[PDB]
Amino acid sequence: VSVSGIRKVQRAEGPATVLAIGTANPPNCVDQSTYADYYFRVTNSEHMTDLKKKFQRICERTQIKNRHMYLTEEILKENPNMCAYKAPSLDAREDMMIREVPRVGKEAATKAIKEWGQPMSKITHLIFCTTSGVALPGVDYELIVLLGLDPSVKRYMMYHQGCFAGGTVLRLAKDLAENNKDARVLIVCSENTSVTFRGPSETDMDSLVGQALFADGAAAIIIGSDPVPEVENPLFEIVSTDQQLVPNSHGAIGGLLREVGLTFYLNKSVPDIISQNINDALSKAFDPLGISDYNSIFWIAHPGGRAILDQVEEKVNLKPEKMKATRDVLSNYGNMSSACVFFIMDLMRKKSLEAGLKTTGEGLDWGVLFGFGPGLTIETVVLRSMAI
């Protein structure tokens, strides 16, 4: 009768809170210090002698030591079109994407749900964020089946978002959890390189650089407002979440879905673009909270690349350590796109707890989470750590 009364009683009351986290990747670990050779070998670009040495240089300064990858030297054999620079292979890539994406996402979810300790039945919303794997019904549908979620879970299929999608989900999860009482949201960001992998091109360097970065791996996050005492354990609270487009950026990061898989460009000016726009976002989100010292807060930045980390650290003037967790994930996993920030969040708390610190935010109270991607989008999420 009263849309006003229904509203008043059906809305959550507190801020969105991260209650559990889970992560998993393809078993196959690929070593970085020997990737340049492996790569030029299975692509048969050995005669590109120069480009090869040049690729080891890249792989070295990569700051990455390991990366999980579904694609194996075997899977690459049965798929010649995927080893070539540009060759019709969209169908093959998508089929691996569609099969493997939900599969790994479920492994991450199970771990998260086990931690959370609650019954799946309680999951009210589902946010599935993947770079690709287009099918109707989508990847989320498969996840519901595999996992056995409720047939009335409200779904949100985020396709082809970009490396900044990490903050996107949190931004979206916030409103879902905070507007509906008992809303418990499941975030699953599964990224797989089956669509971005291809052979080298003497003319396409941007593409050659991505081959040394992108890795595989999923992450499941349980989010919900008004934590049940004792039963549920809050880890972090979503305080605020902004998104922003930097002018003159479209040509920086991007790509298209072609018949030869996902193509992409990464302009060298990225670390700069971020560095020269990162402060405005910082102030925009911490001024309202009286924070001026960006060292008094913990950090979780999307490891788009080492250079980005060096530049932001250099501009904002952060002690080394601030980026220790972030770099730590990059080194053992590489750039799993939207998944990285949650592997870092998981790493931060897991360590803070094994260190005896007073909070999950490296003993600190406030922290910021970034996300960097296409059109040069920046997503600033402000977090509030939880005690003990």
Added chain:
Amino acid sequence: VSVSGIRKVQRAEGPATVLAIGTANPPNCVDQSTYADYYFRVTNSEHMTDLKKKFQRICERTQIKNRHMYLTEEILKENPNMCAYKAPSLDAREDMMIREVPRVGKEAATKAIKEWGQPMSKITHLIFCTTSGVALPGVDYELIVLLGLDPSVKRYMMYHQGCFAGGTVLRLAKDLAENNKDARVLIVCSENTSVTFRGPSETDMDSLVGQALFADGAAAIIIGSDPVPEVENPLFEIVSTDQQLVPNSHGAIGGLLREVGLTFYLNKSVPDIISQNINDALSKAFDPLGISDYNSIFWIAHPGGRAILDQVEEKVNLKPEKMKATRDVLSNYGNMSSACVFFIMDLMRKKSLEAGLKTTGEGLDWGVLFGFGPGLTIETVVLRSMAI
């Protein structure tokens, strides 16, 4: 300092409300009573004599009289791969999709914004829902540029959702508008058939049926909680929004993104699946509100096809008229996927007002909005009409 206080002051207070609507389609109107010939002509499937007559039969019982289409007999000439049943054409289709989708979406938005009367600067969120046109940054990015939206508008790129995406956006818009004070959301659902069009196959009937249904057209909807008196005009209020998966449905509606464009299947059992599951959703959403007579409320159903309309009307026992608006849109526009429901909502109020009725819901107070799509998803949105 108090994530509890920030929350208390930054949240909207009333229910999400539709304040303006705008729609636009490709100028090119294609006549249905002569489509079977046109279609078999530009595809060069004239020798398929039987299939051709069979296609006119389909086109006739279609219940569609007109459909706007970007694709012209000229554009089809310069694109032989798109006239063939299955032929590598993903790149061409996507490029039209990417260029035309945002373009038409902006025309719809301008009209909506003009109506709303407020400055664009006030648009806080952007929900872009299209069946395809994959690029990074995505179609939403382009819309921001074309339209001149703020560089900090929170974006939500809904790609490849399905014919049920109409309710999806409303479901999502609700939480956005209702959780953030002053949040004014822009919903743009632009659907274009450049990706689903192809030639006939003596073996692929499901595909032949879609060629007689799918049309072009965009729709922009302004949504926001706590209407400004006099300045803003509320049209409908979002009361509740559920989503549901019918067991044993995946094979009913669906499709994949292939190198030959978007493929799709439409199983004849759909009108049944809906009809035999439509009541549960109805009760689920109207019982809490004491509504038992589904004729005492106005209706806005996704015109997935005439048969679906006939079956639901037959099961629920609705006077003819209940589906008069819905069928009216289908006849002049066809199935523009996620756009249809908003062209119907626009049509309902536009007529109710020119009829002298007391509300925008055909003089009634409550109404329901449906959405039907892949994996056989049903989205039940309950609306509350606005006065005069």
